């Protein structure tokens, strides 16, 4: 089984290729990592296995979901440390995903009920609704477009959050540059209508992700930095006129960062949408262009993951929904055992046990 051959992810020696995908679960009450998160990540931890956390706030303005953890206060760092410690005691490697939602927020999630920030003043359309703290759905508002000084401030929030992650003991961080959140609001020409040096051309639209990645690389080192993008996922009105072109432009900037650093990033992580053959060729084209480790994600099964590694299409395969419902997903894939079905009703609810740690083991 090629999913169970070992893999060197830079200085991290993985024993198998099954990765916990980052997943917002909303159990981090009032943005504090809770003991429940330790139980949940401990259940899914394996010796030599890689875990990526749910998206994690980099600043008081970065959230657009309730009860998502932060890593920008020293209190948050203190609580994360306890979670990292129980994961490392099972021999897993764990990265913290650093997440800013940009325009995908609401007054209820912002300090002083201020407007969310973005590359432009265009809001998400009424085809999308935001989950509110009371479990109903709300309207996305008009964001505020930020200038070049404030862009540098947001880059510094990424930098400080990455340093905080290392202080908590994380092995590395992942930059969340996908799914129509802040970075993707600069990448996608369906959102970025700027006329300054962050808008227009592919080089200009790539400037923000390049500045973010360079900042976290200088702070903690390239081999502790993973990058996640999704050029072909249209979520939250995040379309590009040429997804393959945009994706290859991002890869170009990552290859160039690696060569200036004399080091490789931890990985490039790309989620696909589910023309099945065109999307497959889009993924293989990004992988072939990127000089390093490639994680694929989005709709993978046991059989689709074995085939991705066997055919050279990916080095690592991350799983989301099957890892919600199967704490021992790795062992179930190894044994080719039945899989529990996930209950979508409790994906984002607040109970520390129900729908979170009570899916059974084999
Ligand atoms: C409940 C839920 C929350 C998610 N939260 C995040 C997130 O916080 N960050 C992110 O980059 N992707 C997030 N994702 C996407 C997953 O990381 C992953 O790409 C997707 O689940 C993989 O597809 P699969 O579920 O078919 O395995 C989330 C997915 C789900 C179902
Ligand atoms: Cl997401």
Phi and psi of 136, rounded to 5°? -100, -175
| Sign of the four-CA dihedral 142, 143, 145, 149 | positive
Per-residue b or e along 246-283, where b marks 16 or more CB atoms closer than 10 Å to that residue's CB = bbbbbbbbbbebbeebeebbbbbbbbbeeeeeebeebb
- Can you tell me which atom of ligand 1 is nearest the CA of 68? 8
Q: How far apart are CA 299 and CA 297, in angstroms?
A: 7
Contact between 249 and 202 under an 8 Å Cβ cutoff? The reply is yes
Q: How many CB atoms neighbour CB 359 within 10 A?
A: 20
Q: ∠ CA(216), CA(99), CA(117), 5° rounding?
A: 105
Query: 338 in a domain, yes or no?
Result: yes
Query: 73 in a domain, yes or no?
Result: yes
Residue 181 annotated to the active site: yes
Q: How many CB atoms neighbour CB 333 within 10 A?
A: 25
Our count of domains for the chain comes to 1
Strands (E) in the chain, as ranges, are 7-9, 12-14, 18-20, 50-57, 93-99, 117-118, 129-131, 137-139, 144-145, 172-176, 225-229, 267-271, 294-297, 316-319
179 is known to lie in a ligand binding site: yes
Query: 352 in a domain, yes or no?
Result: no
10 is known to lie in a ligand binding site: no
Name, in order, each residue with C-beta under 8 angstroms of 52's C-beta and a sequence gap of 6 or more: 19, 20, 21, 22, 94, 95, 97, 174, 226, 269, 318
Q: Is the CB of 229 under 6 A from ligand 1?
A: no
Q: How far apart are CA 301 and CA 234, in angstroms?
A: 22
2 is known to lie in a ligand binding site: no
The ligand with the least distance to the CA atom of 348 is 1
The ligand with the least distance to the CA atom of 53 is 1
Query: 271 in a domain, yes or no?
Result: yes
- Can you tell me which atom of ligand 1 is nearest the CA of 323? 27
228 is known to lie in a ligand binding site: yes
Helix, strand, coil percentages for the chain (3-state, nearest 5): 40, 15, 45
**Ramachandran region, residue 221 (left: φ > 0; alpha: ψ -120 to 50; beta: rest):** left
- Can you tell me which atom of ligand 1 is nearest the CA of 178? 11
Residue 260 Cα to ligand 1 midpoint, Å, equals 32
- Can you tell me which atom of ligand 1 is nearest the CA of 347? 1
Strand partners, 176: 228
Q: Is the CB of 235 under 6 A from ligand 1?
A: no
DSSP 119-171: SSSPPPPTT-EEEPTTS-EEEPPPPEEP-HHHHHHHHHHHHHHHHHHHHHT-S
67 is known to lie in a ligand binding site: no
Query: 361 in a domain, yes or no?
Result: no
Query: 164 in a domain, yes or no?
Result: yes
The full length of the chain comes to 362
Q: Which residues are found with C-beta within 5 Å of the ion, ligand 2?
A: 179
Q: Residue 119 is part of a domain; what is its CATH number?
A: 3.20.20.70
Catalytic residue chosen out of the listed positions 41, 109, 140, 181: 181
* Domain that residue 85 falls in: 2-346
**SS3 state at 180:** coil
Q: Is the CB of 228 under 6 A from ligand 1?
A: yes
Query: 323 in a domain, yes or no?
Result: yes
Residue of minimum CA distance from atom 26 in ligand 1: 299
Query: 231 in a domain, yes or no?
Result: yes
Contact between 320 and 14 under an 8 Å Cβ cutoff? The reply is no
Resolution given for this structure, in angstroms: 1.6
Residue of minimum CA distance from atom 29 in ligand 1: 23
Q: Is the CB of 62 under 6 A from ligand 1?
A: no
Q: How far apart are CA 3 and CA 330, in angstroms?
A: 10
Ligand 1 pocket: which of 24, 308, 344 to mutate (most atoms within 8 A of CB): 24
Q: ∠ CA(162), CA(272), CA(229), 5° rounding?
A: 25
Contact between 247 and 281 under an 8 Å Cβ cutoff? The reply is no
Q: How far apart are CA 206 and CA 252, in angstroms?
A: 10
Residue 342 Cα to ligand 2 midpoint, Å, equals 18
Among 95, 254, 235, residue whose Cα is nearest residue 178 = 235
- Which pair of tokens denotes residue 181? 């959140």
């Amino acid at each position: 089984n090629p999913l169970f051959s070992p893999y060197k992810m830079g200085k991290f020696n993985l024993s198998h290729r099954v990765v916990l995908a980052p997943m917002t679960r909303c159990r981090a009450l009032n943005n504090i990592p809770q003991a429940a998160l330790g139980e949940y990540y401990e259940q899914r931890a394996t010796a030599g296995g890689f875990l990526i956390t749910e998206g994690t706030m980099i600043s008081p303005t970065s959230a657009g979901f309730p009860h998502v953890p932060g890593i920008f206060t020293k209190e948050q760092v203190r609580e994360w440390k306890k979670i990292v410690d129980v994961v490392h005691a099972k021999g897993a490697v764990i990265f913290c995903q650093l997440w800013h939602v940009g325009r995908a927020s609401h007054e209820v999630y912002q300090p002083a009920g201020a407007a969310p920030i973005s590359s432009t003043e265009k809001p998400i359309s009424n085809r999308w609704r935001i989950l509110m703290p009371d479990g109903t759905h709300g309207i996305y508002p008009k964001p505020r477009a930020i200038g070049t000084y404030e862009i540098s401030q947001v880059v510094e929030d990424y930098r400080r959050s990455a340093l905080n992650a290392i202080e908590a003991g994380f092995d590395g961080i992942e930059i969340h540059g996908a799914h129509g959140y802040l970075i993707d609001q600069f990448l996608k020409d369906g959102i970025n209508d700027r006329t300054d040096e962050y808008g227009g051309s592919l080089a200009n639209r790539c400037k923000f992700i390049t500045q973010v990645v360079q900042a976290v690389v200088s702070a903690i080192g390239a081999d502790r930095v993973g990058v996640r993008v999704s050029p072909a996922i249209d979520h939250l009105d995040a379309m590009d006129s040429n997804p393959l072109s945009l994706g290859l432009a991002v890869v170009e900037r990552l290859n160039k960062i690696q060569l200036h650093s004399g080091s490789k990033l931890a990985y490039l992580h790309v989620t696909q949408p589910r023309s099945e053959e065109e999307e497959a060729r889009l993924m293989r084209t990004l992988r072939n262009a990127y000089q390093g480790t490639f994680i694929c994600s989005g709709g993978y099964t046991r059989e689709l993951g074995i085939e991705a590694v066997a055919q050279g299409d990916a080095d690592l395969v991350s799983y989301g929904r099957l890892f919600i419902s199967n704490p021992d997903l790795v062992m179930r894939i190894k044994l080719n055992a039945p899989l529990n079905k996930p209950n979508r009703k409790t994906f984002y609810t607040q109970d520390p046990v129900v729908g979170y740690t009570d899916y059974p083991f084999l």
